[PDB]
Amino acid sequence: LPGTLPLASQESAVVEDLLYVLVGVDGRYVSAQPL
Amino acid sequence: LHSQLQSLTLRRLLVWTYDPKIRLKTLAALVDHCQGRKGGELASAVHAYTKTGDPYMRSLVQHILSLVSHPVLSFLYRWIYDGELEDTYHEFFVASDP
Numbered sequence: 636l637p638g639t640l641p642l643a644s645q646e647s648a649v650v651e652d653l654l655y656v657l658v659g660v661d662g663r664y665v666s667a668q669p670l
Numbered sequence: 671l672h673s674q675l676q677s678l679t680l681r682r683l684l685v686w687t688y689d690p691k692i693r694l695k696t697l698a699a700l701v702d703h704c705q706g707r708k709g710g711e712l713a714s715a716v717h718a719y720t721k722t723g724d725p726y727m728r729s730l731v732q733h734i735l736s737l738v739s740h741p742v743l744s745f746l747y748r749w750i751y752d753g754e755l756e757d758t759y760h761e762f763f764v765a766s767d768p
Binding site for chain 1: 680681684
């Protein structure tokens with residue numbers, strides 16, 4: 636629930652999510668869609 | 671890999687086990703191409719894959735061939751210098767008649 640979450644801290648949650656997607660494995664927030 | 675579990679994580683495992691996902695993909699597909707072949711016919715079906723095109727495989731299978739083709743070159747160096755073939759199982763391509 637990143638909407639009810641502070642601003643300066645939720646950015647540190649995306650950067651760990653976005654650090655998986657660069658590998659291929661899906662993530663928590665930044666997900667993939669079928670081709 | 672087990673000694674470090676006491677640190678490594680999933681996204682860290684991918685790089686550790688990225689190479690043994692290939693050797694375990696040639697060998698796991700080398701035993702299906704030669705299923706019913708026995709004798710020399712098997713040493714001829716593990717040679718059809720030697721030319722994988724890439725140097726990471728053309729240099730793996732070309733080693734298993736150097737072991738599988740050792741018994742074949744054992745009959746040959748026996749049937750050439752001594753002329754005494756002996757194989758209860760029919761493997762050598764020279765078949766005698768009692």
